[PDB]
Amino acid sequence: CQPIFLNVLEAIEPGVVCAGHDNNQPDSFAALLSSLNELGERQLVHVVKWAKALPGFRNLHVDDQMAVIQYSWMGLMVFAMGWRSFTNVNSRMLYFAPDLVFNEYRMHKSRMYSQCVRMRHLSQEFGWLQITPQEFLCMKALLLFSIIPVDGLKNQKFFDELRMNYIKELDRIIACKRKNPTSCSRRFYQLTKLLDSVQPIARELHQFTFDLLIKSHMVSVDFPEMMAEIISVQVPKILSGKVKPIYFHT
Amino acid sequence: KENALLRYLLDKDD
Numbered sequence: 032c033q034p035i036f037l038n039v040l041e042a043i044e045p046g047v048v049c050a051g052h053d054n055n056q057p058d059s060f061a062a063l064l065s066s067l068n069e070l071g072e073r074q075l076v077h078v079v080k081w082a083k084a085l086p087g088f089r090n091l092h093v094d095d096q097m098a099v100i101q102y103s104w105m106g107l108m109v110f111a112m113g114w115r116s117f118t119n120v121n122s123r124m125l126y127f128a129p130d131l132v133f134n135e136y137r138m139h140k141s142r143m144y145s146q147c148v149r150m151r152h153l154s155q156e157f158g159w160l161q162i163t164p165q166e167f168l169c170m171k172a173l174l175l176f177s178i179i180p181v182d183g184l185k186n187q188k189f190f191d192e193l194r195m196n197y198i199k200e201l202d203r204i205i206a207c208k209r210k211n212p213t214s215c216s217r218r219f220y221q222l223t224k225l226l227d228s229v230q231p232i233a234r235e236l237h238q239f240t241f242d243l244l245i246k247s248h249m250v251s252v253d254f255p256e257m258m259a260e261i262i263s264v265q266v267p268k269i270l271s272g273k274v275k276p277i278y279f280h281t
Numbered sequence: 282k283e284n285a286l287l288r289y290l291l292d293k294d295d
């Protein structure tokens with residue numbers, strides 16, 4: 032009676048990814064943001080390899096596979112970053128990468144202090160709720176299937192079945208090692224609330240990156256190849272209401 | 282697909 036599903040998620044979990052930032056140089060808006068964009072491109076490559084290895088993922092239509100990756104990367108990366116911050120610096124700072132750790136001073140220099148405050152808060156939730164490594168892994172996987180277009184995907188049916196199974200697994204991690212049914216229901220309630228709080232944060236970051244892309248030539252900020260294309264084509268659909276997140280609560 | 286690079290990353294074996 033081994034955790035086949037959990038074994039897989041643990042086995043495919045990406046490793047450490049550096050941004051290539053030079054902490055030796057004085058912090059400047061352009062340098063910090065250029066480093067974040069580069070980190071995004073690097074983690075994006077890792078999110079693709081991780082996703083392809085997820086149970087059932089290759090069952091979706093190829094066009095849908097690219098759609099969920101293009102729409103949910105922000106949320107996925109913010110959630111993982113929140114976990115890294117918690118486990119590494121106990122949510123004291125934002126652990127984007129080993130060579131890119133944000134303190135209060137960098138949060139201000141990046142011109143996105145408010146958004147950083149919410150990310151730090153999410154990170155603190157991992158501690159306040161005592162989120163376990165297993166629960167973390169399952170929630171992150173579910174985040175890949177939490178945002179889609181209102182007009183539906185090419186094969187909406189396969190997607191619905193896939194998302195339904197992942198919610199079921201999360202239920203399994205909570206159900207097991209817990210006799211009291213009231214505590215199970217309470218736990219599911221708390222975790223679904225946690226997952227929903229990720230969406231508002233991702234939207235604010237979407238708006239911010241989109242605006243920066245438009246005026247990137249003025250602030251001397253560079254956007255990688257894939258990043259610039261996703262933000263100019265996919266992100267706008269999110270901001271115009273064409274693509275929306277799936278919330279458990281209202 | 283549209284995002285040529287991304288599309289390549291998906292169908293490429295690693």
Ligand SMILES: C[C@]12CCC(=O)C[C@@H]1CC[C@@H]1[C@@H]2CC[C@]2(C)[C@@H](O)CC[C@@H]12
Pocket residue numbers: 064067068069070071074105108109112126127128236239240243
């Ligand atoms: C996803 C990244 C990079 C990977 C990560 O750890 C989370 C973090 C959240 C803020 C993003 C950043 C990538 C580059 C962005 C999109 C900047 O343009 C503005 C917001 C930044």
